[PDB]
């Protein structure tokens, strides 16, 4: 393999953690126009072994480390300290492009499980827009399935491996922290249409079957672990939100999820703990498109008319893999 560039239509003046870094590490691009398609061509793909994923993982780590400075970091009994000014934080689109001597193949088969032969191949010079969204359980601001929902795993029969779902219909989520009013400045809530959401599962579940015969599926909350993977976590405006999804995973109104702002977090960049400064004042509010989930399946028990699925995640490579699956780098020969 080889190292790639990237691309970002990010402003030079707008001082925001993503933009300022994007301005000093990318290019606007690109050579028009489209993906030159191939016909009657067959090519092998493998989403789970794709060097572009590893390269992306390293870049986003560098961004956060240079952008969101924790005041204190603890790893292996060692303490690191630095300035931790509050910053503005918000996702930016990103494309990855190939250098002189390589090209990026793109699989266009609508129903693709990530492995095997692709019959509608093409060749772009750079990828689609990727939002470097760091989160657990729920994938936000991603790309939608072309037709109906699609699921992918390294081995569905193996319970240790995560199942990646790709929705075909976005579910908008509004999280807000009111100006508090004798109130807890860390108390926030998330609202989503109950009616809208009670139809997305009705389509995922149908496809979760079929693989597991006519077993009945039940969703339960996380079995336990760090608070960060038991709850739906994400970064909003530099602030860290943690949302209880029990009502979301209990098998025609509104779902209201309770939230907490935390200053102490276990790092995704490295095994350890980090502390950020207290939350800013005023309203903190973010609207995002839910486009996917990460699931793990309860094993052990036999076909007791249930397999049971619980929210997972943690390895942010899975977040990157969910978007980068349909690409591969090749050498011209």
């Amino acid at each position, epitope marked *: 393999n080889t190292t790639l560039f990237c691309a970002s239509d990010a402003k030079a003046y707008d001082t925001e953690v993503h933009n300022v870094w994007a301005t000093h590490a*990318c*290019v606007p*691009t690109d050579p*028009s*126009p489209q993906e030159l398609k191939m016909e009657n061509v067959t090519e092998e793909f493998n989403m789970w072994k794709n060097n572009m994923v590893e390269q992306m993982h390293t870049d986003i780590i560098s961004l956060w480390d240079q952008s969101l400075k924790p005041c204190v970091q603890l790893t292996g009994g060692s303490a690191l300290t630095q300035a931790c000014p509050k910053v503005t934080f918000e996702p930016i689109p990103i494309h990855y*492009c190939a250098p002189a001597g390589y090209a990026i193949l793109k699989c266009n088969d609508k129903e693709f499980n990530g492995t095997g032969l692709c019959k509608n191949v093409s060749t772009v010079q750079c990828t689609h827009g990727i939002r470097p969204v760091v989160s657990t359980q729920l994938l936000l601001n991603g790309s939608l399935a072309e037709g109906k929902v699609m699921i992918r795993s390294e081995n569905i029969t193996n319970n240790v491996k995560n199942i990646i779902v790709q929705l075909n219909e976005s579910v908008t989520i509004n999280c807000t922290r009111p100006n508090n009013s004798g109130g807890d400045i860390r108390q926030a809530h998330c609202n989503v249409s109950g009616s809208q959401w009670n139809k997305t599962l009705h389509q995922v579940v149908e496809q979760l079957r079929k693989y597991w015969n006519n077993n009945t599926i039940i969703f339960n909350s996380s079995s336990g672990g760090d608070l960060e993977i038991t709850t739906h976590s994400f970064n909003c405006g530099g602030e860290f939100f943690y949302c209880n999804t029990s009502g979301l995973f209990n098998s025609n109104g509104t779902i209201t999820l309770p939230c907490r702002i935390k200053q102490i977090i276990n790092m995704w960049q490295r095994v350890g703990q980090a502390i950020y400064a207290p939350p800013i004042q005023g309203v903190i509010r973010c609207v995002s498109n839910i486009t996917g989930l990460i699931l793990t399946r309860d094993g052990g028990g036999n076909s007791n008319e249930n397999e049971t699925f619980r929210p997972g995640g943690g390895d942010m490579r899975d977040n990157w893999r969910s978007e980068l699956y349909k690409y591969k780098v090749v050498k011209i020969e």
Partner: antibody
Amino acid sequence: QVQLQQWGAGLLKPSETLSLTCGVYGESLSGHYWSWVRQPPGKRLEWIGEIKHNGSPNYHPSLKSRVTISLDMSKNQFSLNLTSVTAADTAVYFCARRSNWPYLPFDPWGQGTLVTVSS
Amino acid sequence: DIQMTQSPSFVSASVGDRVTITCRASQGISSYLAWYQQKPGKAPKLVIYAASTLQSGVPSRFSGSGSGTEFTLTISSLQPEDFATYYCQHLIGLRSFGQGTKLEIKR
């Protein structure tokens, strides 16, 4: 071959607006970034901003409180607006093409328009 | 913010001589550097991009090398038309230029 020609009023008084235009002949504006660069007397070149498709220009930090760049696609021309000019904006102003990645260097260049700001 | 520094600031050279001028960036910029030629009263002209690749039409006596923070423009044998002020430019970020290197004729 491709030619960049510039026009616009170059004698201004303080607090007025500088408005220059650059026409492109031999090529369309499509799929190309189009940029402005200025050169104060006896000093180095300074990037003002660039743009390809209407709805996403990119400007210098020190000027974005004052600068507008826009495309006139039907005539294959583009323009630079600069509000609240002072003596410090006295310079030769150039327009220049900026093709798609990785052809990022500015090329070709217009002949430049002399702009003098004084009362 | 990234800063471009050209050296030397001022060169005096005879016709026929070889000359090499350098441009140093305050932080790494890999090969995202270009050189322009500008004569007095005239617009800059593209000479080299991607550190070492000549623009079509540029004479073979020109060449360039470098990557990261140290870059090079070389003329193997000067002709009268080459005497001018040369600017380097960071091709991304703030698109900042060097302060320029003036090449004058010795006599």
